[PDB]
Amino acid sequence: MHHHHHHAPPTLWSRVTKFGSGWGFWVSPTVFITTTHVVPTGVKEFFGEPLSSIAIHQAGEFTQFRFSKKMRPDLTGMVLEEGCPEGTVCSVLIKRDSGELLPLAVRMGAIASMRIQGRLVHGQSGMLLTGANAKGMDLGTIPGDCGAPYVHKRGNDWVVCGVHAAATKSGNTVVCAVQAGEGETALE
Structure with missing residues (x-):
């Protein structure tokens, strides 16, 4: 009784973040994800986080974003x-x-x-x-x-x-x- 089609998680929708020419996701407070073709060329910081304190790890159209600090704007894990x-x-x-x-x-x-x-x-x-x-x-x-x-x-x-x-x-x-x-x- 009442199972098919249900409300979607709000915080789950806020996790997504349109960056450059694509969209990413908030893997965690200090963790993020993003593609390779989406990454643009001009910015040097995300949500106020200079690349100087960030980590990148490519892996078949899969880049691992590791921030030096945990913004935790509305995430948890x-x-x-x-x-x-x-x-x-x-x-x-x-x-x-x-x-x-x-x-x-x-x-x-x-x-x-x-x-x-x-x-x-x-x-x-x-x-x-x-x-x-x-x-x-x-x-x-x-x-x-x-x-x-x-x-x-x-x-x-x-x-x-x-x-x-x-x-x-x-x-x-x-x-x-x-x-x-x-x-x-x-x-x-």
């Missing part, structure tokens, strides 16, 4: 899911200027190691499940909404998948930029 099983419905957070939030949805596929620029990277595909917002280099972007963060309900909370990397030739299929860490060395 989110969970990162390195991919997803077969049948995982993820949702992106597309915020606009006039508050036109565009909540997109995508169905996760299988986990495999793709090859980009002669580099093996681990990422989970994702078939579109909305209409046809995909253009070819993203699930649904127009004014520069690339790299958007993915979210999903996990137990009694919402875990983040990756970021809007790009779309496939099929159009209704994008790749969720996953992070590198545990799970690859573990056996189970």
Whole structure:
């Protein structure tokens, strides 16, 4: 009784932050995420945090933002899911200027190691499940909404998948930029 379709977490929507030519997410008080193609060239600080006191770590369209200080504007600590099983419905957070939030949805596929620029990277595909917002280099972007963060309900909370990397030739299929860490060395 009353289960399908429910209210979305507010703080979860505020986590997203349109930077440069894309959108990121607040991994934690002093932690953040962002894509590579989204990163612009002109700014030297984020939310009042000079790069001089920041750390960057690329990894297949996955940059690790480590701030020297914990801004903690309205966060606490989110969970990162390195991919997803077969049948995982993820949702992106597309915020606009006039508050036109565009909540997109995508169905996760299988986990495999793709090859980009002669580099093996681990990422989970994702078939579109909305209409046809995909253009070819993203699930649904127009004014520069690339790299958007993915979210999903996990137990009694919402875990983040990756970021809007790009779309496939099929159009209704994008790749969720996953992070590198545990799970690859573990056996189970």
